[PDB]
């Protein structure tokens, strides 16, 4: 009931840029293995145990941030259901540490080598240290997404990555069948150490704000070709395809003649002998037939795509000089004809795109049949190992293979042009594309002439301008009345709509934004030249009401970087003297001693209370009667209207129920059972007209941030940590997850719109540790068992398809105590159900604001050489004070209270009470207060 404070460390994370995974028809390998060694560790630096964990991570969900986050902060590997780690004593997953009976049983130390192996066929991650295997293994985890090696660490630790054989050498031999991680590097990119995700970067001029980064998916490695052999083109196959085959034979033999290749009646590659050595290909030859399959397949693919085949002036092709001779041909060969159709008709851009897609399809089909054979991808070719470095999709292929597969198709397309072909060419992810940066709301200005600058390092989609303090993180910049912004990617001024203005920018050009609150004007200057409107007005916007104030704001698209210069140093301000200096405009934050703190829209979904003014949803608190318990009903305001939105809804209750520390076993209702029971009841009623197949009823853990709009019961996170003895037989097997629900369609399958409402009850036991489900008084086959010291929130996921959807009923059954006793200590023995004001329904929200730290960890990474591999080191301490919310089991920065005006007031009154209780010489309580607020916190 009171916010906690403590000092924590900053923990960062580094990956090796190797993404692996599996799917149906993928070209990747299902077994991997890598090595990390430790050089320097300084324990207990800055009065806190040094963080150091090595393991794997998932691209989809593992997105740590420099702030506090879940738990008490300092999240690393294993503090989420998307990563699994190993610190020396325990295996980390889901922020739970389970000790492992390793041979060494000691924390990570200098001169320690850790080998990690991953199996995707049967999902399993195993670790070993200095050749000694650990007893515990992770199993049965979700295979969605791609896996990459990862290390999390605080300051004062130096490590080296033995990635395969090219970069470092393995201290111990890999287990059989486990490929080194150096083999999974894509042909387009080289090996490079990098952080997982970031919203800023160090640059020459200063910090560069970066936006979202595009990431590959596990389904991007599969080939998806088009069945072109089904389509047949007899009118071309009769004559046109043999004309194409004739010229292909011409070019083929031209290649041999240009090469050292000699003429010989029998094929002798040793003496370079030409098996045919005839100018006109002998048609009965099965090789000539296979060239007929050449032409046939090419025409079939052309017709299968959007191309329209046809003949236009083939007599013109016959009329031009087709028999172009170089007089260098071998005396066995005849006059090799060169049509030279390029001079008559060059390849159009559309034509070269057609060549590109034809080559892409031709490579995709081959990749598909190689996958059918059972080949895989490797950085080094190994024919006996069924590894090919060229079976990646055509998009992932390098340009050398592209041109090698493109040259012959370019010649064929030139022949087609010469013959005269008439071929003619034919919710959650939204937040992951745009990141918004803005200044703190304490810097709002309501008067004067202010100026700041922005630099577009990468030509792309960014929007720079001024915004209101109320500006929401979900909405795009300028889509509402809360932002006057300029988009230089297309040259559009944006405020409650988009209108053309100015011109698009380039890379490296600086745009200066100037606001004049005396004249109510906004001016955008590109490289010192004022951008011009179509009408002929220098002001982008005018007649602007001051209102509550304005703040600088900028938004960046995917893979974009930008340099924002508020103007703390005038010497670093460009074009300010050109425009703004003599016009009475001052740089933003000119006399400020410290740099301006900025806020960014973090994309981590979290549960927030349902606002009372929400236009689409309304929650009613219905009281209890003689035969009905208290209940919270959900309704749709805008149902059955043109301007209505229907989507998946994730709702929970604001208060949790916590299990016992130790599981010590354990009509007219009998009082001994009433005051000796431990089970609790909680029901959900789905109204008539709402499909039972679109509701999920159960419980959730405090760590649930999955906002997938196509939620299925098979998309929930789940892992099993298995601890075995030395002999290998497992003695422990613990399941971990974050969502224990059932599906309403299961009860309705056994049996359109039904009149009867569906009541589903969830029985919980806080002593045994199990929860069961019942439907309409009928026992179900679904049971769940959980570990002690676990707190769960009741929750429902619903797809609204009716005016009235769901009702949270909070009552009691026979010999069963209601949820009020479980939630509240003061009512622990009250059989009468009740709903105090604290109990409330909360909805999942995708985006929220967050505060960027003032200082960041300085991590230095390089490569020592092939003997030592890549090296990572960090040695600068960095701490922060965290504020912890007890019930939600999550913390936040103490400096974030500058905008949270309610928690700040509550904490100030808490401090006042702290002084009051120990006031007037109560030393016995002053001593006790030290365990809550300590000397280090006070000095900090």
């Amino acid at each position: 009931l009171l916010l906690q404070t403590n000092l924590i460390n900053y923990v960062t994370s580094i990956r090796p840029n190797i993404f692996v995974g599996r799917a149906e028809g993928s070209t990747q390998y299902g077994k991997w293995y890598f090595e990390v060694m430790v050089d320097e560790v300084v324990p207990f630096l800055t009065a806190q145990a040094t963080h150091l964990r090595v393991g794997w991570a998932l691209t989809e969900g593992y997105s740590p941030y420099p702030g506090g986050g879940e738990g008490w902060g300092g999240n690393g590997v294993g503090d989420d259901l998307y990563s699994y780690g190993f610190d020396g004593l325990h295996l980390w997953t889901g922020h739970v540490a389970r000790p492992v009976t390793s041979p060494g049983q000691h924390l990570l130390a200098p001169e320690d080598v850790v080998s990690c192996c991953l199996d995707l066929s049967v999902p399993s991650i195993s670790f070993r240290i200095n050749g000694c295997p650990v007893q515990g293994v992770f199993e049965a985890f979700n295979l969605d997404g791609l896996f990459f090696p990862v290390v999390s660490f605080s300051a004062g630790v130096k490590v080296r990555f033995l990635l395969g054989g090219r970069h470092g050498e393995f201290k111990f031999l890999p287990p059989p069948g486990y490929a080194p991680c150096h083999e999974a590097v894509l042909p387009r990119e080289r090996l490079r150490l990098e952080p997982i995700k970031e919203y800023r970067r160090e640059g020459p001029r200063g910090p560069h704000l970066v936006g979202p980064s595009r990431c590959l998916s596990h389904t991007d490695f599969v080939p998806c070709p088009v069945d072109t052999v089904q389509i047949v083109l007899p009118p071309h196959l009769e004559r046109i395809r043999e004309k194409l085959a004739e010229n292909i034979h011409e070019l083929w033999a031209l290649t041999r003649i240009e090469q050292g290749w000699t003429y010989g009646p029998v094929r002798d590659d040793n003496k370079r002998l030409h098996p045919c050595l005839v100018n006109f290909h002998s048609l009965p030859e099965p090789e000539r037939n296979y060239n007929l399959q050449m032409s046939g397949e090419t025409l079939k693919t052309l017709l299968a795509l959007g191309c329209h085949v046809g003949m236009a002036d083939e007599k013109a092709e016959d009329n031009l000089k087709k028999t172009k001779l170089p007089k260098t041909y071998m005396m066995s060969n005849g006059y090799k004809p060169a049509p030279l159709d390029l001079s008559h008709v060059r390849l159009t851009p559309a034509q070269t795109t057609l060549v590109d897609r034809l080559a892409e399809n031709g490579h995709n089909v081959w990749a598909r049949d190689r996958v059918a054979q059972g080949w895989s991808y490797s950085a080094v070719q190994d024919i006996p190992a069924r590894r090919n470095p060229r079976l990646v999709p055509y998009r992932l292929l390098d340009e050398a293979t592209k041109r090698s597969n493109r040259d012959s198709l370019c010649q064929a397309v030139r022949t087609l042009l010469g013959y005269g072909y008439n071929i003619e060419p034919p919710n959650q992810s939204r937040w992951d594309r745009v990141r918004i940066f803005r200044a703190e709301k304490s810097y709002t200005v309501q008067s004067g002439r202010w100026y700041f600058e922005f630099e577009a390092v990468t030509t792309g989609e960014m929007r720079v301008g001024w915004a209101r303090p109320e500006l929401r993180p979900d909405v795009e910049l300028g889509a509402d009345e809360l932002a006057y912004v300029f988009n230089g990617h297309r040259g559009q001024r944006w405020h409650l709509g988009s209108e053309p203005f100015g011109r698009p920018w380039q890379s490296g050009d600086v745009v200066g934004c100037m606001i004049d609150l005396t004249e109510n004007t906004i001016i955008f200057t590109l490289n010192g030249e004022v951008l011009m409107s179509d009408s002929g007005s220098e002001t982008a916007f005018r007649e602007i009401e001051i209102g509550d104030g304005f703040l600088p704001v900028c938004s960046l698209g995917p893979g974009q970087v930008g340099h924002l210069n508020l103007g703390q140093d005038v010497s670093s301000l460009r074009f300010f003297a050109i425009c703004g200096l003599q016009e009475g405009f001052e740089p933003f934050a000119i006399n400020m001693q410290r740099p301006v703190t900025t806020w960014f829209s973090k994309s981590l979904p979290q549960f927030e209370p349902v606002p009372p003014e929400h236009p689409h949803y309304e929650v009613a608190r219905m009281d209890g009667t003689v035969d009905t318990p208290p209940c919270l009903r959900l309704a749709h305001r805008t149902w059955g209207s043109q301007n209505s939105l229907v989507e998946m809804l994730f709702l929970r209750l604001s208060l949790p129920v916590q299990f016992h520390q130790h599981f010590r076993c354990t009509n007219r209702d009998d009082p001994e059972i009433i005051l000796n029971t431990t089970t609790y009841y909680y029901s959900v009623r789905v109204f008539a007209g709402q499909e039972p197949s679109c509701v999920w009823v159960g419980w959730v853990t405090p760590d649930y941030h999955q906002h997938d709009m196509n939620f299925d019961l098979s998309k929930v996170r789940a892992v099993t940590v298995t601890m075995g003895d030395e002999q290998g037989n497992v003695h422990s097997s613990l399941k971990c997850s974050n969502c224990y629900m059932v599906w309403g369609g299961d009860f309705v399958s056994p049996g359109r719109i039904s009149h009867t409402d569906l009541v589903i009850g969830c029985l919980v036991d806080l002593a045994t540790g199990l929860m069961t489900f019942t439907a309409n008084g009928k026992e179900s086959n679904t049971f769940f068992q959980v570990e002690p010291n676990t707190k769960l929130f009741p929750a429902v996921f619903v797809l609204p398809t009716h005016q009235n959807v769901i009702q949270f009923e909070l009552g009691k059954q026979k010999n069963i105590m209601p949820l009020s006793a479980a939630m509240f200590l003061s009512e622990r023995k009250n059989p009468a159900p009740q709903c105090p004001p604290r109990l409330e329904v909360q909805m999942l929200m995708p985006v929220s604001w967050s505060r960027m730290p003032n200082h960041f960890l300085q991590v230095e990474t390089r490569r020592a050489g092939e003997r030592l591999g890549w090296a990572v080191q960090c040695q600068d301490p960095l701490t922060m004070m965290a504020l912890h919310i007890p019930e939600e089991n999550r913390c936040m920065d103490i400096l974030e209270l500058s905008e949270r005006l309610d928690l700040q007031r509550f904490h100030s009154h808490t401090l006042r009470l702290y002084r009051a209780v120990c006031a007037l010489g109560n030393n016995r309580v002053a001593h006790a207060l030290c365990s809550h607020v300590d000397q280090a916190q006070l000095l900090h």
Partner: nanobody
Framework: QVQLQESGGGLMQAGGSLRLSCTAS????????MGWYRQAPGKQRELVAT???????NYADSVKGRFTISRDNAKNTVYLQMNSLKPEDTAVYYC?????????????????????WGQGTQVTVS
């Protein structure tokens, strides 16, 4: 998917006769020039004489001795007979078939990579 099952190349003394039967089972398209590769243990891989549809054989430097290679395209079978065993002829022998005919490809890299490498056998000379 076309699989080449090859059986033969038994271990006998020098001068013996070895019969190797290779059968390609799979798709009906692109079955030409199905031939033989050899690889000595710890040595480079070489190409043995490869027969093509129409009874055309492409020879190399390792065809020395008494070789005879015949094929039937009705069942995609090859009956390779060796009568000259040499101590340097001990190797793993693989039977490989592909769309490429007479060791030529008018496409380039794609069809070159377009090979159907089946299982192989062991050839040992005392």
């Amino acid at each position: 998917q076309v699989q080449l099952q090859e059986s033969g190349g038994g271990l006998m003394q020098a001068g013996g006769s070895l019969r190797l039967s290779c059968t390609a089972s799979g798709s009906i398209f692109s079955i030409n020039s199905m031939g033989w590769y050899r690889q000595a243990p710890g040595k480079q891989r070489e190409l043995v004489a490869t027969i093509t549809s129409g009874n055309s054989i492409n020879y190399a430097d390792s065809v020395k001795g008494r070789f005879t290679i015949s094929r039937d395209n009705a069942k995609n079978t090859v009956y390779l007979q060796m009568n000259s065993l040499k101590p340097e002829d001990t190797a793993v022998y693989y039977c490989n078939a592909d769309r490429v005919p007479n060791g030529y490809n008018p496409w380039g890299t794609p069809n070159d990579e377009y090979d159907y490498w089946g299982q192989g056998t062991q050839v040992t000379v005392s």
